[PDB]
Design a protein around this ligand. Structure first.
Ligand SMILES: C=CC[C@@H]1/C=C(\C)C[C@H](C)C[C@H](OC)[C@H]2O[C@@](O)(C(=O)C(=O)N3CCCC[C@H]3C(=O)O[C@H](/C(C)=C/[C@@H]3CC[C@@H](O)[C@H](OC)C3)[C@H](C)[C@@H](O)CC1=O)[C@H](C)C[C@@H]2OC
Ligand SMILES: C=CC[C@@H]1/C=C(\C)C[C@H](C)C[C@H](OC)[C@H]2O[C@@](O)(C(=O)C(=O)N3CCCC[C@H]3C(=O)O[C@H](/C(C)=C/[C@@H]3CC[C@@H](O)[C@H](OC)C3)[C@H](C)[C@@H](O)CC1=O)[C@H](C)C[C@@H]2OC
Lengths: 107, 107
C-alpha cells in the first residue's frame, strides 16, 4: 500500500532495522499538492521507531525501503493510512496521502 | 464496510440524525470473541456525535442504522476501522472488529 519514488539517493547501504529510531524531515500533502503538515515548519525532525504500530503502516513500510540520506515521495493508500475515517478536519475519508520524506539518521 | 445484526429491536422510529449526540453502551471484540474494550466496565455510557470524523467510519455508519433501544452486533471491515495499522498493543493490523452496541438515547 505504499509507492516510493526517489528524489535524491541515500547511501544505498544503511536501511532502517526493526527497533531503530528513524530521524526524518517530512511534509505531508494531499494528492493535489495541498500541504497538511511539515516537520520543518516546527523546525524539529520527527523521530519514530519501526515495528511498534506507532505510525501508519504505509509510512513504516515506505521508510523501511529508504537508506540514510535518501529523499523520497511516499504515496500511501488509504487503508495504509486513515482509511474510510480520515482525521477530523485534516484528512478526508478515503484519502491517498503523499509524504516527501528525508531520512536523516538512524539512532 | 459494516454489517449490522440485530440482537434486540429498537423502536423502529427514532434513528440518529447528523449532528445529534448518541449515548450507547458497547463492548468491542476481535472476531474470535476476544474483548478489547467495554464502556460498561468503566460504568459510564459512551457518547459521540455523528458526522464529525470523530469515531471510525464503520461505527458511524453502523449506529446510524439503529433506532433507539436497539441492541446490535456491528462487524466492521479494517478499512472502516484501523486498517493496516491497527492500534498499538490493542488491535492487530488488518483486523475486523465486532462491537456489541446498545443505542440508549439521542441528545
Ligand atoms: C497527542 C497526541 C499524541 C501523538 C501526537 C502528536 C505528536 C501530534 C502532532 C499534532 C502532529 C502529528 O504527528 C507528528 C500529526 O501528524 C499528521 O499531521 C501527519 O502528518 C501524520 O499522518 N503522521 C506523522 C508523521 C508520520 C506518519 C503519520 C503518523 O503515523 O502519525 C502518527 C499517528 C497519528 C498514528 C496513529 C497511531 C494509532 C493508530 O491506530 C493509527 O492508525 C490508524 C495511526 C503519530 C506520529 C502518532 O504516533 C503520535 C501521536 O498521535 C497527522 C495527519 C495528524 C497527527 O496528529 C495526530
Ligand atoms: C486521549 C485521547 C482522546 C480520545 C480518547 C479516549 C476517550 C480514550 C479511551 C482510552 C478509550 C477509547 O474510546 C472511548 C478507546 O476505544 C477503543 O477501545 C475502541 O473500542 C474504539 O475503537 N472506539 C471507541 C468506541 C467508538 C468506536 C471507536 C472510536 O471511534 O474511538 C475513537 C477513535 C480512537 C477515533 C479515531 C479518531 C481519529 C481518526 O483518524 C481515526 O481513524 C483511523 C479514528 C475515540 C472515541 C476517539 O474519538 C476519542 C479519543 O481518541 C479503541 C480501540 C482505543 C481507544 O483509545 C484511543
Amino acid at each position: 500500500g505504499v509507492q516510493v519514488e526517489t528524489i535524491s539517493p541515500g547511501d544505498g547501504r544503511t536501511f532502517p532495522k526493526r527497533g531503530q529510531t528513524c530521524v526524518v524531515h517530512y511534509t505531508g500533502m494531499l494528492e493535489d499538492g495541498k500541504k497538511f503538515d511539515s516537520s520543518r515548519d516546527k523546525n524539529k525532525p520527527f523521530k519514530f521507531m519501526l515495528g511498534k504500530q506507532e505510525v501508519i503502516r504505509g509510512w513504516e513500510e515506505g521508510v523501511a525501503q529508504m537508506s540514510v540520506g535518501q529523499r523520497a515521495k511516499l504515496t500511501i493508500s488509504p487503508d495504509y493510512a486513515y482509511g474510510a475515517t480520515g482525521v477530523p478536519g485534516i484528512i478526508p475519508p478515503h484519502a491517498t496521502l503523499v509524504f516527501d520524506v528525508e531520512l536523516l539518521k538512524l539512532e
